[PDB]
Design a protein around this motif. Structure first.
Motif, PDB file in Angstrom:
ATOM      1  N   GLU A  26       0.943  -1.106   0.303  1.00 18.74           N
ATOM      2  CA  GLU A  26       0.097   0.121  -0.132  1.00 18.74           C
ATOM      3  C   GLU A  26       0.801   1.725  -0.051  1.00 18.74           C
ATOM      4  O   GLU A  26       1.419   1.409   0.707  1.00 18.74           O
ATOM      5  CB  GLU A  26      -0.562   0.116   1.150  1.00 18.74           C
ATOM      6  CG  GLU A  26      -1.869   1.457   1.650  1.00 18.74           C
ATOM      7  CD  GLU A  26      -2.785   1.083   2.642  1.00 18.74           C
ATOM      8  OE1 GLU A  26      -2.317  -0.112   3.459  1.00 18.74           O
ATOM      9  OE2 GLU A  26      -3.554   2.099   2.667  1.00 18.74           O
ATOM     10  N   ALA A  27       0.751   2.216  -1.082  1.00 23.16           N
ATOM     11  CA  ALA A  27       1.079   3.391  -0.473  1.00 23.16           C
ATOM     12  C   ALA A  27       0.353   4.398  -1.245  1.00 23.16           C
ATOM     13  O   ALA A  27      -0.461   4.890  -1.712  1.00 23.16           O
ATOM     14  CB  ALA A  27       2.404   3.146  -2.044  1.00 23.16           C
ATOM     15  N   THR A  28       0.644   5.402   0.039  1.00 23.40           N
ATOM     16  CA  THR A  28      -0.606   6.502   0.262  1.00 23.40           C
ATOM     17  C   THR A  28      -0.184   8.210  -0.556  1.00 23.40           C
ATOM     18  O   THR A  28       1.209   8.454  -0.533  1.00 23.40           O
ATOM     19  CB  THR A  28      -0.237   7.016   1.408  1.00 23.40           C
ATOM     20  OG1 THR A  28       0.593   8.247   1.882  1.00 23.40           O
ATOM     21  CG2 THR A  28      -0.988   5.712   2.819  1.00 23.40           C
ATOM     22  N   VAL A  29      -0.930   8.221  -1.221  1.00 21.08           N
ATOM     23  CA  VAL A  29      -0.156   9.311  -2.378  1.00 21.08           C
ATOM     24  C   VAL A  29      -0.212  10.409  -1.960  1.00 21.08           C
ATOM     25  O   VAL A  29      -0.821  11.204  -1.137  1.00 21.08           O
ATOM     26  CB  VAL A  29      -1.862   9.189  -3.701  1.00 21.08           C
ATOM     27  CG1 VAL A  29      -1.372  11.154  -4.520  1.00 21.08           C
ATOM     28  CG2 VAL A  29      -1.823   8.269  -4.144  1.00 21.08           C
ATOM     29  N   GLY A  30       1.136  11.049  -2.356  1.00 17.12           N
ATOM     30  CA  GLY A  30       1.530  12.131  -1.611  1.00 17.12           C
ATOM     31  C   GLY A  30       2.686  11.541  -0.412  1.00 17.12           C
ATOM     32  O   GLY A  30       2.864  12.952   0.043  1.00 17.12           O
ATOM     33  N   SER A  31       3.110  11.164  -0.208  1.00 15.96           N
ATOM     34  CA  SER A  31       4.375  10.446  -0.040  1.00 15.96           C
ATOM     35  C   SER A  31       5.821  10.301  -0.437  1.00 15.96           C
ATOM     36  O   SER A  31       5.323   9.897  -1.962  1.00 15.96           O
ATOM     37  CB  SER A  31       3.670   9.326   1.424  1.00 15.96           C
ATOM     38  OG  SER A  31       3.195   8.431  -0.197  1.00 15.96           O
ATOM     39  N   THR A  32       6.757  11.077   0.172  1.00 19.73           N
ATOM     40  CA  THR A  32       8.090  10.426  -0.390  1.00 19.73           C
ATOM     41  C   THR A  32       8.182   9.246  -0.774  1.00 19.73           C
ATOM     42  O   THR A  32       7.931   8.874   0.262  1.00 19.73           O
ATOM     43  CB  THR A  32       9.132  11.398   0.394  1.00 19.73           C
ATOM     44  OG1 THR A  32       8.722  12.762  -0.144  1.00 19.73           O
ATOM     45  CG2 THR A  32      10.398  11.239  -0.212  1.00 19.73           C
ATOM     46  N   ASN A  42      25.379  13.467  -8.892  1.00 20.61           N
ATOM     47  CA  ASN A  42      25.277  11.767  -8.472  1.00 20.61           C
ATOM     48  C   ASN A  42      24.897  12.548  -6.768  1.00 20.61           C
ATOM     49  O   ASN A  42      24.953  12.285  -5.961  1.00 20.61           O
ATOM     50  CB  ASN A  42      26.508  11.535  -7.701  1.00 20.61           C
ATOM     51  CG  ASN A  42      27.204  10.491  -9.130  1.00 20.61           C
ATOM     52  OD1 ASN A  42      26.251  10.052  -9.676  1.00 20.61           O
ATOM     53  ND2 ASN A  42      27.811   9.116  -8.714  1.00 20.61           N
ATOM     54  N   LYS A  43      23.570  13.462  -6.474  1.00 18.09           N
ATOM     55  CA  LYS A  43      22.704  13.656  -5.419  1.00 18.09           C
ATOM     56  C   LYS A  43      21.501  13.413  -5.129  1.00 18.09           C
ATOM     57  O   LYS A  43      21.045  13.592  -6.273  1.00 18.09           O
ATOM     58  CB  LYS A  43      23.076  15.547  -5.648  1.00 18.09           C
ATOM     59  CG  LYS A  43      23.139  16.045  -4.040  1.00 18.09           C
ATOM     60  CD  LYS A  43      23.338  17.561  -4.599  1.00 18.09           C
ATOM     61  CE  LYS A  43      23.222  18.306  -3.394  1.00 18.09           C
ATOM     62  NZ  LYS A  43      23.131  19.591  -3.465  1.00 18.09           N
ATOM     63  N   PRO A  44      20.694  13.354  -4.434  1.00 20.23           N
ATOM     64  CA  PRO A  44      20.244  12.292  -4.280  1.00 20.23           C
ATOM     65  C   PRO A  44      17.987  13.314  -4.528  1.00 20.23           C
ATOM     66  O   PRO A  44      18.937  14.282  -3.711  1.00 20.23           O
ATOM     67  CB  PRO A  44      20.001  11.267  -2.957  1.00 20.23           C
ATOM     68  CG  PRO A  44      21.138  11.898  -2.726  1.00 20.23           C
ATOM     69  CD  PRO A  44      21.982  12.170  -3.132  1.00 20.23           C
ATOM     70  N   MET A  45      17.882  12.797  -5.451  1.00 25.62           N
ATOM     71  CA  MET A  45      16.216  13.470  -5.756  1.00 25.62           C
ATOM     72  C   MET A  45      15.663  12.751  -5.045  1.00 25.62           C
ATOM     73  O   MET A  45      15.194  11.039  -5.840  1.00 25.62           O
ATOM     74  CB  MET A  45      16.170  14.325  -6.829  1.00 25.62           C
ATOM     75  CG  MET A  45      17.486  15.110  -7.096  1.00 25.62           C
ATOM     76  SD  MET A  45      17.359  16.777  -6.805  1.00 25.62           S
ATOM     77  CE  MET A  45      18.713  16.824  -5.233  1.00 25.62           C
ATOM     78  N   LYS A  46      14.778  12.912  -4.069  1.00 24.41           N
ATOM     79  CA  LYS A  46      13.089  12.027  -3.698  1.00 24.41           C
ATOM     80  C   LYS A  46      12.265  12.026  -4.782  1.00 24.41           C
ATOM     81  O   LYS A  46      11.661  13.268  -6.033  1.00 24.41           O
ATOM     82  CB  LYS A  46      13.247  12.676  -2.491  1.00 24.41           C
ATOM     83  CG  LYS A  46      14.245  11.693  -1.530  1.00 24.41           C
ATOM     84  CD  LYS A  46      14.519  10.556  -1.969  1.00 24.41           C
ATOM     85  CE  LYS A  46      15.120   9.897  -0.190  1.00 24.41           C
ATOM     86  NZ  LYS A  46      14.177  10.111   1.083  1.00 24.41           N
ATOM     87  N   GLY A  47      11.618  10.937  -5.227  1.00 22.67           N
ATOM     88  CA  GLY A  47      10.066  10.408  -5.584  1.00 22.67           C
ATOM     89  C   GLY A  47       8.961  10.957  -5.060  1.00 22.67           C
ATOM     90  O   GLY A  47       8.443   9.435  -4.521  1.00 22.67           O
TER      91      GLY A  47
END
Length: 48
Positions: A26-32, A42-47
């Protein structure tokens, strides 16, 4: 894990990676999420 890297891309303007995905967990819409990640400099970007 799908990995795809590309060195000589001319950074003109802000890039977006996007995907359509169906998950069993289950994945709640609006969560990183830790799932789809773009690394520029080479830097993290969150989706979210």
């Amino acid at each position: 894990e799908l990995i795809a890297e590309f060195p000589n891309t001319a950074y003109y303007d802000n890039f977006i990676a996007s995907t359509w995905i169906r998950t069993a967990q289950e994945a709640t819409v609006g969560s990183t999420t830790d799932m789809l990640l773009l690394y520029v400099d080479n830097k993290p970007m969150k989706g979210t």
